[PDB]
Ligand binder design. Structure first.
Ligand SMILES: *[C@@H]1O[C@H](CO)[C@@H](O[C@@H]2O[C@H](CO)[C@@H](O[C@@H]3O[C@H](CO)[C@@H](O)[C@H](O)[C@@H]3O)[C@H](O)[C@H]2NC(C)=O)[C@H](O)[C@H]1NC(C)=O
Ligand SMILES: *[C@@H]1O[C@H](CO)[C@@H](O[C@@H]2O[C@H](CO)[C@@H](O[C@@H]3O[C@H](CO)[C@@H](O)[C@H](O)[C@@H]3O)[C@H](O)[C@H]2NC(C)=O)[C@H](O)[C@H]1NC(C)=O
Ligand SMILES: *[C@@H]1O[C@H](CO)[C@@H](O[C@@H]2O[C@H](CO)[C@@H](O[C@@H]3O[C@H](CO)[C@@H](O)[C@H](O)[C@@H]3O)[C@H](O)[C@H]2NC(C)=O)[C@H](O)[C@H]1NC(C)=O
Ligand SMILES: *[C@@H]1O[C@H](CO)[C@@H](O[C@@H]2O[C@H](CO)[C@@H](O[C@@H]3O[C@H](CO)[C@@H](O)[C@H](O)[C@@H]3O)[C@H](O)[C@H]2NC(C)=O)[C@H](O)[C@H]1NC(C)=O
Ligand SMILES: *[C@@H]1O[C@H](CO)[C@@H](O[C@@H]2O[C@H](CO)[C@@H](O[C@@H]3O[C@H](CO)[C@@H](O)[C@H](O)[C@@H]3O)[C@H](O)[C@H]2NC(C)=O)[C@H](O)[C@H]1NC(C)=O
Ligand SMILES: *[C@@H]1O[C@H](CO)[C@@H](O[C@@H]2O[C@H](CO)[C@@H](O[C@@H]3O[C@H](CO)[C@@H](O)[C@H](O)[C@@H]3O)[C@H](O)[C@H]2NC(C)=O)[C@H](O)[C@H]1NC(C)=O
Ligand SMILES: *[C@@H]1O[C@H](CO)[C@@H](O[C@@H]2O[C@H](CO)[C@@H](O[C@@H]3O[C@H](CO)[C@@H](O)[C@H](O)[C@@H]3O)[C@H](O)[C@H]2NC(C)=O)[C@H](O)[C@H]1NC(C)=O
Ligand SMILES: *[C@@H]1O[C@H](CO)[C@@H](O[C@@H]2O[C@H](CO)[C@@H](O[C@@H]3O[C@H](CO)[C@@H](O)[C@H](O)[C@@H]3O)[C@H](O)[C@H]2NC(C)=O)[C@H](O)[C@H]1NC(C)=O
Ligand SMILES: *[C@@H]1O[C@H](CO)[C@@H](O)[C@H](O)[C@H]1NC(C)=O
Ligand SMILES: *[C@@H]1O[C@H](CO)[C@@H](O)[C@H](O)[C@H]1NC(C)=O
Ligand SMILES: *[C@@H]1O[C@H](CO)[C@@H](O)[C@H](O)[C@H]1NC(C)=O
Ligand SMILES: *[C@@H]1O[C@H](CO)[C@@H](O)[C@H](O)[C@H]1NC(C)=O
Ligand SMILES: *[C@@H]1O[C@H](CO)[C@@H](O)[C@H](O)[C@H]1NC(C)=O
Ligand SMILES: *[C@@H]1O[C@H](CO)[C@@H](O)[C@H](O)[C@H]1NC(C)=O
Ligand SMILES: *[C@@H]1O[C@H](CO)[C@@H](O)[C@H](O)[C@H]1NC(C)=O
Ligand SMILES: *[C@@H]1O[C@H](CO)[C@@H](O)[C@H](O)[C@H]1NC(C)=O
Lengths: 383, 383, 383, 383
């Protein structure tokens, strides 16, 4: 009988229930504890702490508390300022750091003990660039929201120096959802081919404002960078004649994965979606799908390593954990068929640049898979 | 008799002498200790610690050591990953954090206790954009080096959506100085109007490689984003017929400032510039000029606040410093005429968006001031 | 066992080692003395004297000293003022005079006893004129250094009276290497097609100054009159996109000749090339290559004439040497395959107007043979 | 009573009488010996030797014979190959060398003991260049005879790089007076503005052949480089309507000079001019006029130096003559009003670049002075 303790550092909300990632972290730990073939005779427990996500000092205190109590991994603070602080703690004290969201990896950072399960925007900007070639675009307009979106789509911005695109980079307004002065300039500029770098909460907001202005016609085509395009109530836009392409790594066409999504709406039951926020009703985001996967990919590594004993490391007397070097190598060699497809890592750095997308577009009936993407193959679009 | 202790967290070098910022921090503290009108009867001492600059854990330990010994300010780790960790420590424990280099301020960071003395690239990208209007450019090519340079020049990249520029964003090769495959594509692409986002060490390297390929003619024009264009041995390029514009905030035309630059070459004497690195011989970089200024701008605040007593704060029992709220307000209200012009801060956030540049170009005689820039006025170019 | 004594009159240097011609004269005499098939059972010795090269009185004293001791040939004073004095001594006293450098032969000079091994500029000005036809030039600019260069390139200057060239004859500054006021007039005059009449020491100097001004672009083409274009460190100019044509009589593509060039760097070892003089490291000049050949071509004549006995001639009682008439006819009928190709003489006067050049140009990889020249054939340019 | 012995090295003719320079050397020495104010109580004697003029060995033997007998000056071998040999003898042994004909002074010749009385072609090529400006020429054709004529007229050849001339350099045939294939190309090329670099013997020959072909019309203009244009029987060309410009330094408009020219035809009486050689009957050439002057300019120096004693110098034991340094300085400071105008020398090198020409042209009446030239003033053409 073993007691492994996966750490976690999640968002602190005062009014609603626990977040989507903290639910999926608790739902995953309960899944391996019930299921018997994966990790027999062990009992995964958890040590979830809650932070502000914008406080690198508070994230570093909770990371040293989890190392003092003793963890075998830390499943990310999930924000760029807080994740870089906890990554360097986990690098110095041996213990792995599991990331499920994208952040800017600075080029001269010699950190080994981290893996990210979010699909890398080195690969995702090539998938978007393959679509604008397939659709024969020449007047692309990238619309992002925050200044880090330039780093995300940098291979798309450098594309007119190797092809015949003509980019017109624009930015959403600072914090307000008043995208109407942006969309007036896009409508007057005759820009019919738009790539949005947004989240699905902000994709839904500007799609209501593109309806009310001029822009949900059969002349406009919208590629979406977000992987949660399948979580939009697209009922006002089905008959609109529009073309709305995108991607989806959440492999919802398996019977096994769709079983878990149907289980997900049960225990989540609280926090209903407010009506003028036209996301769909019951779904896993790809944010929570990668946190459900991250517990399983580390679980592949602990099944291949049974003699693990959790130690109580100390930050101001920082010494590496005894099995931190081998167990990190088992996480970077782990293969898993999770909610988000195949999960293999990039041996050099530790990212997911090898993954399987599903190109989805908006048809009259609904929002349907019209192709596939694969870094080896490319676009296999059976449209 | 007072004993104020300004902290500092600088780069650790194993072979050469102390860095340019740590020299200028020691040279500034010795200057106020000698000079009598600024801070009478007090003695500024220092507590310089040395880190790797790429280790947010090591930067956070040295910041808690300086808070344990007791400081009244921390003069920056001077790298983006390390500065964001020490900013959140200084925000939680009251003590100000003085920054002298640019880093990405994420938009939802509610940090108050920090000021940056580096000229903001919100203002510097408008100064570069005013030059490409004045020079009547329409085929601009931005060349940057690291992925954060997109965030720096984002107002220049968004400019073809409000003017008639046609940007072609390119990137230098990853770490090597083999910019020849980049410059072949720029020469074959007939790109004569280039903006380089580099440092002066990398500006000197690609200017040697632009000479040897095709590109230092009278057809090519080079705007440089760096503020240390005046520190290039431009003797191979004076008669080249080229046009090489740029900026300079280091106000070298005063008798008072040029006295300090002449003092600077004396005590620095070690570490000579190697010959195939064609920077000039004796100069302050704008990196060290802002660290000389940062000690003085905080010195204006302590002259207006004589009853300051340094306290010994603790990180794991984090309580704000007693005078941290008032003394931070005096730093954000400080005015100073330093090496880099007028130093006034941006009351909203804490940046320098109000500063005085000097547009310099390459003439046959040398590298001379051909104008001025000011966020209020604009380009007053007496060419 | 014979003792033949070839005379020699070379440059007197006070600081460095012996000159390139005096080394090659000593290296050649040692070669025939070792090698057995050419001249069996004889031992060539030498009688090298050193002069100022600008003193026809001192050159005439050393020539009468060598005739008093007794020589069978004199291998040139190698300067125009000194060579004409020693030519008339050798004509009056019978003994041959071997020349390895060009000088102005006045038309009414009835001298028989001399041969020159330097390629005649009657033939070399036609080879340059064939290149400006092949390259379809019409705006040729000849740049020479001393006033005798007009005599050298006179068939190139008389060419617009039989073709459609438009010559613009210019001269380098008097003694200084300040060719920048010359190159300003050539750049402002839009003169992209330049023929330089220089030595390789002065070709290297003005190529550094053409780089620093405007002129090493892909618009400028430089034909070089010198036969030592292969002895330039052209590493700063390979990627420059320039076109730099020229000639080479030193037949470096044979295994036998390249063996001797590899032997040459061994014994020469002293006198390294100073860095800002960007000639290559180890090479025979064509000046020393013709002095290595001149000992061998005379050696062909003494193998065909075994009964030669060296006599002690006197200048103030001038009587011709007994075998001077026959042995001079054997030198003018000698054939040899030396370092500089085939060596046959011009029966009428005694020059080399029949020789084999190798047209070399500057490519991106290096400086490569792009054709051939031959007075019979013409340009066979397999470019 | 003194006995000064001026040396001389002149041409050896086998059939006719002594040459024009040797007559004028004997006529000048007889003139100072008769006349009493210039050199009282001294008796100039002479030591004229005769050479082949194309033998630098024979010229060097006669120069050492005159130094052995003892001379105070040597009045030139008067040919370029022979003069450079005797110049270096006179430089090494102290004794001055007086030149009366042009030769190529190589630029790195450090010879002090020589003066030339022939007008320098540095100044004479500017006088020809001032005429082609005054006559508003733009299609100039230079015709020379030997390859040294390029060195003579080099400032005229370099003139299209600073003005709007368009030179077409041509050469007379090698030795024959068959200039008809040259004049066919000049007539077919529509070249009406011709500069001839010739002697007056060859100017008369090609003027007979320009009459018989097409070219003595009112369309053709001929500038002559020779200073003996006044010695042409121009009676067939007076009414021809031609324009034939030229120069004249022989100052035939003085009563004193025209007395000497009338004396000259008396003692010369032998050697009549053959009819088909249409030079005039009785005249001093400027060759003999400068030899008459050269004895007088040296005579100014010996009047200012009475204690001169002629010494017997030796060539193979070469030691400078005791008063050679001072007496050479008196020749370079001598002023004289001779047959050829004012005779002042060029302190730097020793040439005549300051002289007074007389521009003469062909009118219907005869060949008349139409202007003046002076290096200070320029063309004062009272036409
Ligand atoms: C509960 O059972 C297993 C617990 O191990 C869960 O994961 C699976 O673990 C086994 C251990 O090697 C592997 O079996 C695979 O099962 C899938 C069923 O979809 C089948 O397609 C494969 O050929 C193989 O038999 C596998 O590593 C892993 N499954 C996957 C998809 O990676 C399993 O997910 C849990 N649920 C059920 C309903 O079994
Ligand atoms: C592990 O990580 C490295 C670096 O992230 C991966 O290297 C990258 O691999 C791709 C494919 O070889 C390189 O080229 C790109 O490929 C697309 C394929 O669609 C092609 O269309 C483009 O020509 C594009 O250049 C990419 O440059 C390369 N990056 C570097 C720095 O070498 C590597 O593939 C990963 N290993 C895996 C996934 O096994
Ligand atoms: C010691 O530090 C004091 C700092 O106050 C220096 O005194 C003054 O410092 C500033 C230079 O930043 C100057 O004051 C200003 O001058 C302008 C005109 O240039 C005037 O408009 C302002 O009202 C203000 O006075 C001033 O140059 C300088 N004072 C003097 C006399 O130079 C002081 O120079 C420092 N001492 C040493 C030895 O460096
Ligand atoms: C304190 O900070 C804020 C922002 O950090 C400063 O406001 C900024 O002011 C500039 C100039 O007025 C605005 O930028 C540009 O104005 C130019 C005028 O030519 C024009 O090309 C564009 O329309 C562009 O907007 C900038 O928008 C504005 N920032 C914000 C967020 O509104 C403010 O001036 C600072 N206070 C000081 C220096 O006292
Ligand atoms: C010693 O000198 C003799 C000179 O005869 C060298 O023998 C031969 O010299 C010439 C090189 O100039 C070559 O002869 C010719 O070769 C061509 C083919 O390359 C052939 O067509 C001719 O019929 C003639 O034979 C030849 O390379 C060379 N002989 C050998 C065996 O290499 C001899 O090489 C000199 N010895 C040394 C040690 O250098
Ligand atoms: C011995 O010497 C004489 C001259 O030193 C050589 O004669 C010269 O031969 C060349 C070539 O045939 C003639 O030059 C040029 O011919 C080209 C053919 O393309 C043409 O562009 C011109 O018409 C030009 O004349 C040159 O005129 C001629 N020289 C003389 C004085 O006739 C002779 O070939 C030598 N003997 C040998 C190498 O056996
Ligand atoms: C014979 O008499 C003198 C001998 O000395 C010859 O040359 C002249 O020498 C005197 C001595 O200084 C100078 O007199 C000048 O005479 C000319 C007459 O043309 C006059 O114009 C001057 O104002 C001055 O009085 C002078 O240096 C020199 N003459 C010249 C022209 O340079 C003279 O040439 C001989 N013949 C006659 C007829 O006197
Ligand atoms: C002594 O000899 C030197 C060198 O031969 C003479 O120097 C030369 O003098 C002229 C006049 O200053 C220079 O310029 C030329 O002048 C003409 C006048 O008509 C003018 O039109 C042109 O602009 C032309 O450049 C010439 O360059 C200069 N040479 C050198 C090497 O400096 C000097 O004048 C002589 N001294 C005398 C005659 O007192
Ligand atoms: C949607 O996609 C189809 C197929 O690529 C294309 O024909 C159509 O024009 C697109 N709609 C747009 C661009 O509005
Ligand atoms: C596209 O998918 C089909 C069906 O799975 C398969 O033939 C192959 O993977 C792809 N086709 C091509 C031509 O690559
Ligand atoms: C540099 O300045 C000159 C003169 O103002 C002008 O050619 C242009 O502004 C620049 N040169 C270029 C772009 O070649
Ligand atoms: C720019 O030039 C002068 C120099 O300082 C300045 O005084 C003037 O006011 C400015 N001109 C403008 C802003 O038009
Ligand atoms: C050099 O060669 C290239 C290719 O043959 C051609 O541009 C031309 O011949 C030369 N280049 C010039 C004159 O710029
Ligand atoms: C030039 O090229 C080849 C290569 O050596 C040569 O054999 C051939 O005879 C020549 N071709 C001609 C002269 O047409
Ligand atoms: C001779 O000179 C006059 C005056 O310069 C000129 O008018 C005439 O045309 C000239 N004769 C020619 C060029 O044949
Ligand atoms: C031309 O000569 C006249 C008369 O000798 C005289 O006025 C002056 O020297 C010259 N005139 C000018 C204007 O130079």
């Amino acid at each position: 009988t073993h007691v492994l303790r996966f750490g976690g550092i999640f968002e602190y909300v005062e009014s609603g229930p626990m977040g989507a990632e903290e639910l999926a972290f608790r739902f995953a730990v309960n899944t391996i504890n019930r299921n018997r073939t994966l990790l027999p005779n062990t009992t995964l427990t958890y040590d979830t702490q809650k932070i502000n996500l914008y406080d690198s000092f508070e994230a570093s205190k909770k990371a040293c508390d989890q190392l003092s109590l003793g963890v075998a991994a830390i499943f990310g603070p999930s924000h760029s300022s807080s994740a870089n602080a906890v990554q360097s703690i986990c690098n110095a004290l041996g213990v792995p750091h599991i990331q499920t969201r994208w952040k800017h990896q600075v080029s001269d950072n010699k950190d080994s003990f981290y893996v990210s399960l979010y699909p890398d925007f080195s690969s995702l900007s090539r998938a978007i660039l393959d679509l604008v070639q397939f659709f024969k675009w020449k007047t692309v307009t990238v619309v992002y929201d925050d200044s880090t979106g330039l780093i995300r789509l940098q291979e798309l911005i450098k594309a007119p120096s190797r092809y015949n695109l003509r980019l017109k980079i624009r930015q959403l307004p600072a914090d307000t959802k008043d995208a109407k002065p942006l969309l007036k300039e896009m409508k007057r500029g005759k820009e019919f081919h738009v790539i949005f770098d947004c989240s699905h909460e902000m994709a839904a907001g500007i799609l209501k404002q593109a309806l009310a202005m001029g822009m949900m016609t059969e002349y406009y085509h919208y590629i979406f960078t977000t992987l949660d395009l399948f979580a939009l109530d697209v009922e006002p836009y089905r008959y609109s004649g529009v073309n709305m392409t995108g991607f989806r790594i959440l492999n919802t066409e398996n019977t096994q994965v769709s079983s878990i999504i149907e289980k997900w709406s049960m225990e989540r039951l609280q926090a209903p979606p407010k009506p003028d926020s036209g996301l769909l009703d019951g779904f896993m985001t790809t944010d929570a799908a990668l946190m459900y996967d991250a517990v399983h990919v580390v679980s592949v590594a602990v099944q291949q390593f049974p003699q693990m004993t959790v130690s109580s490391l100390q930050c101001n007397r920082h010494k590496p954990w005894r099995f931190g070097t081998r167990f990190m190598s088992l996480i970077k060699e782990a293969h898993w068929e999770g909610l988000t497809g195949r999960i293999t890592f990039n041996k050099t750095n530790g990212l997911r640049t090898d993954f399987d997308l599903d190109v989805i577009s908006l048809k009259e009936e609904g929002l349907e898979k019209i192709g596939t993407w694969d870094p080896a193959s490319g676009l296999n679009m059976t449209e």
